Design a protein around this nucleic acid. Structure first.
Ligand SMILES: [Mg+2]
Ligand SMILES: [Mg+2]
Ligand SMILES: [Mg+2]
Ligand SMILES: [Mg+2]
Ligand SMILES: [Mg+2]
Ligand SMILES: [Mg+2]
Ligand SMILES: [Mg+2]
Ligand SMILES: [Mg+2]
Ligand SMILES: [Mg+2]
Ligand SMILES: [Mg+2]
Ligand SMILES: [Mg+2]
Ligand SMILES: [Mg+2]
Ligand SMILES: [Mg+2]
Ligand SMILES: [Mg+2]
Ligand SMILES: [Mg+2]
Ligand SMILES: [Mg+2]
Ligand SMILES: [Mg+2]
Ligand SMILES: [Mg+2]
Ligand SMILES: [Mg+2]
Ligand SMILES: [Mg+2]
Ligand SMILES: [Mg+2]
Ligand SMILES: [Mg+2]
Ligand SMILES: [Mg+2]
Ligand SMILES: [Mg+2]
Ligand SMILES: [Mg+2]
Ligand SMILES: [Mg+2]
Ligand SMILES: [Mg+2]
Ligand SMILES: [Mg+2]
Ligand SMILES: [Mg+2]
Ligand SMILES: [Mg+2]
Ligand SMILES: [Mg+2]
Ligand SMILES: [Mg+2]
Ligand SMILES: [Mg+2]
Ligand SMILES: [Zn+2]
Lengths: 37, 176, 214, 146
RNA sequence: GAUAACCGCUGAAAGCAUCUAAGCGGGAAACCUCUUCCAAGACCAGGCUUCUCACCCUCUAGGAGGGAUAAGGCCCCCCG
RNA sequence: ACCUCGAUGUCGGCUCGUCGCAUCCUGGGGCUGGAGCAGGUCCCAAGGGUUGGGCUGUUCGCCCAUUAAAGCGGCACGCGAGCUGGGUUUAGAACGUCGUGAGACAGUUCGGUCUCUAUCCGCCGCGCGCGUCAGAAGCUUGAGGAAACCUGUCCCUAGU
């Protein structure tokens, strides 16, 4: 899971949310899990 | 929104009780109680429904509308038909048995593990590989099911562990 | 419940177990204690038992202490302490007047022994704090046993309360814990504990059950 | 000239303030007001001539926003690294009273007279107090319109 | 016990979906109890209890001042 | 070139620490081009721990035997009214080089005085006085603090 200042939907199965004050991108692919920090 | 805009069916055998913003549902399987949100309104439509209505379209009430609607629906269905979860095991030597009302897992640890079914939940093994968990509460059944599910690390190589019934695990193979 | 008793440290010697291994023992006279008072939450705010040990002449007892013993109904003793209990069901079995001896303990029982350690006078940082000294040769000038630096320059500009310096040492409450009771001489009112006990000979110790190994 | 109190000029009144579902800052500011004596026309900044204040139900104080988890009370023990922090949350069920009184102490003057003034504050976490003998008249948190 | 990262449950807004938005959980040598020691000059100076619980004089009768005592202690003495 | 030239002592080592976390070990995880063993990377985590020698004035650094690991930093590049004095920076002498010379060299070599009875704050201990609405004594509650916290190997589980 990346923790980077910029998170983007790498693939079309990814989708961006705000959970507990953080922008996250969540996909069915575990490699694409990614959040801001 | 639209889901929060339609009332919940109540069957001819299930009786409801409304007091203040609190309510309860009683049916063949058991009884349940629930509390309804503040800005939302809950009404007994005597023509056979419970109507959940938002006074306005502010985002808070717009949000709590469907939430409260689904809470009432889950309450009623849980008291009428109950909530059951089928859940399977995979691997050689990964086995399931019972002990009193508790359900015991032997999943390749150097010690056995066993889970005590908490209140309103009854475990029921139907095969050393296949077992089910049932209850009057949708949230409790799901939570204890998830607790069972995560007694092993995910296995993308052999798949061994506790899987749900209808779940298709992802699996990647190491080169050896 | 956490049992305990007051006694004196007689001395220490050695014994050989059945498997023929020498065991250093401190010998404690866990002589008779009368319980003189009960402390209860309903009245005092906590549950504890006040018990008295020793032999003392009534001529040497001050009138308030003699009166506090008369209200109990027991002859005065030299030392008075109390056991902190935990609940009221623990103090249900203590009644003002009754007795307790070394037979409260047994073989293999782990006990915590509280004593007061020996006085070491005004001690320096090497004895007191295990400081490394400084060189005995190679030019060291009159600093062979001194602490040296006690802070930093101008920031913070002070010496950080808690700095380890030299002063009075010893004479402190010390609890040595998980000490095995090798053997209770029941008839002679003695008990033999494997290990060392704080204090001088003929000093008051409190031998309690162990909480870590009970 | 201007009135200054003589020896037997100060009279003390006993106020009980209920703290159930009241804002902590509002309650503390009012209690500081009628603890210092700012409501008396005979006020004089030299003299400690306020009133006694009992705060009842200091448990039920209301703290707005999200301060029950991210607001802290810091103490320092004087030793290097001797700083400890307790949230408003922990402080409300460890022992609650000081929370309320903490606020009031921060709005009294930090001088010797403020130390004398503090002694008139009686905070109780329960709904009842032992001072029924002084007939404490209930006090309502009122605002004067303009 | 409460949590960090992390893992979730039930779930709208947004007919499907999502650990969150309403609510409910798991979660570390870090934090809070826990173990040890100091601790009421903690000025909110605490609690339980025992002992003594008395005897005169002056100034001018309002308060103060002086003195002899109790319970107790201190010094002197023999020591550690 | 802002304070200090009617004086703010300059490197390294010793003693004693103290704080940060930008984590070296130990603890919790997500992703792997992660089968296991062992890793890579990122995230959380500062409680404790973090060796002895050879070479060198050494810091740095090179190496030797270990270790769970041999972390990086701030504090007047912490610490000389606490130590040292190998380095550097007087005066002696010599080499090389420059200079006609006197002499000079971010060139080298050998030698070369490290003062102070602690006033105040600070800190480590120890008493005397008054206070806690009479005077005393025994036992105590604890708000609030301080201390401590490290870790390996072997064997069963399982040659699973
Ligand atoms: Mg990128
Ligand atoms: Mg030495
Ligand atoms: Mg000298
Ligand atoms: Mg010498
Ligand atoms: Mg200096
Ligand atoms: Mg300073
Ligand atoms: Mg849904
Ligand atoms: Mg969703
Ligand atoms: Mg203090
Ligand atoms: Mg007292
Ligand atoms: Mg006396
Ligand atoms: Mg200029
Ligand atoms: Mg200047
Ligand atoms: Mg200068
Ligand atoms: Mg000068
Ligand atoms: Mg000077
Ligand atoms: Mg000067
Ligand atoms: Mg230092
Ligand atoms: Mg970090
Ligand atoms: Mg770290
Ligand atoms: Mg790790
Ligand atoms: Mg990893
Ligand atoms: Mg800790
Ligand atoms: Mg050398
Ligand atoms: Mg350092
Ligand atoms: Mg320096
Ligand atoms: Mg430094
Ligand atoms: Mg120096
Ligand atoms: Mg010097
Ligand atoms: Mg030299
Ligand atoms: Mg010369
Ligand atoms: Mg020439
Ligand atoms: Mg405490
Ligand atoms: Zn994706």
């Amino acid at each position: 899971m990346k923790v980077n200042p910029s998170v983007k939907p790498i693939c079309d199965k990814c989708r961006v949310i705000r959970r507990h004050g953080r922008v996250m991108v969540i996909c069915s692919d575990p490699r694409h899990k990614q959040r801001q920090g | 929104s639209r889901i929060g805009k339609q009332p919940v069916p109540v069957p001819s055998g299930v009786d409801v009780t409304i007091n203040g913003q609190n309510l309860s549902v009683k049916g063949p399987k058991g009884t349940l109680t629930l509390d309804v949100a503040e800005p939302i309104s809950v009404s007994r439509a005597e023509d056979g429904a419970i109507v959940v209505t938002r006074p306005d379209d502010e985002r808070r009430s717009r949000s709590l509308h469907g939430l409260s609607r689904t809470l009432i629906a889950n309450l009623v269905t849980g008291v009428t038909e109950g909530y059951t979860q089928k859940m399977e095991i995979f691997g050689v030597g990964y086995r399931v048995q019972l002990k009193g009302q508790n359900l015991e897992f032997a999943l390749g640890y150097s010690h056995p593990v066993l889970i005590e079914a908490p209140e309103g939940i009854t475990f029921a093994v139907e095969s050393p590989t296949k077992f089910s968990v049932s209850g009057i509460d949708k949230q409790k059944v799901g939570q204890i099911s998830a607790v069972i599910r995560r007694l092993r690390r995910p296995d993308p190589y052999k798949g061994k562990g506790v899987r749900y019934e209808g779940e298709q695990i992802r699996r990647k193979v190491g080169k050896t | 419940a956490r049992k305990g008793i007051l006694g004196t440290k007689l001395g220490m010697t050695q014994v050989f177990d059945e498997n023929n291994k020498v065991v250093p023992v401190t010998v404690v006279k866990a002589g008779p204690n009368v319980v003189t008072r009960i402390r209860t939450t309903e009245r005092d705010g906590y549950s504890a038992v006040q018990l008295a040990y020793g032999e003392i002449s009534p001529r040497k007892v001050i009138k308030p202490v003699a009166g506090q013993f008369a209200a109990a109904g027991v002859n005065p003793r030299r030392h008075v302490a109390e056991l902190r209990l935990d609940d009221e069901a623990a103090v249900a079995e203590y009644e003002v007047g009754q007795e307790l001896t070394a037979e409260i303990f047994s073989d293999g029982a782990y006990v915590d022994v509280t004593g007061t350690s020996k006085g070491k006078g005004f001690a320096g940082t090497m004895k007191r704090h295990g400081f490394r000294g400084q060189g005995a040769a190679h030019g060291a000038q009159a600093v062979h046993r001194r602490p040296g630096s006690i802070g930093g320059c101008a920031t913070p500009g002070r010496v950080f309360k808690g700095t380890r310096m030299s002063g009075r040492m010893g004479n402190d409450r010390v609890t040595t814990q998980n000490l095995k009771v090798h053997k209770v001489d029941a008839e002679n009112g003695v008990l033999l504990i494997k290990g060392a006990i704080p204090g001088r000979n003929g000093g008051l110790v409190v031998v309690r059950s162990a909480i870590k190994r009970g | 000239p201007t009135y200054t109190p003589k020896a037997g000029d100060t009279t003390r009144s006993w106020y009980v303030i209920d703290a159930s579902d009241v804002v902590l800052g509002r309650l503390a500011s009012a209690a500081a007001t009628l603890l210092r004596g700012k409501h008396k026309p005979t006020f004089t900044p030299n003299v400690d001539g306020g009133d006694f204040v009992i705060v009842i139900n200091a448990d039920k104080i209301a703290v707005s926003g999200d301060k029950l988890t991210k607001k802290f009370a810091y103490r320092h023990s004087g030793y290097p690294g001797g700083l400890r922090k307790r949230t408003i949350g922990e402080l409300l069920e460890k022992h609650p009273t000081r929370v309320v009184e903490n606020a009031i102490i921060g709005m009294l003057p930090h001088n010797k007279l403020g130390r004398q003034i503090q002694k008139k504050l009686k905070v109780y976490a329960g709904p009842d107090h032992p001072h029924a003998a002084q007939q404490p008249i209930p006090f309502e948190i009122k605002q004067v319109a303009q």
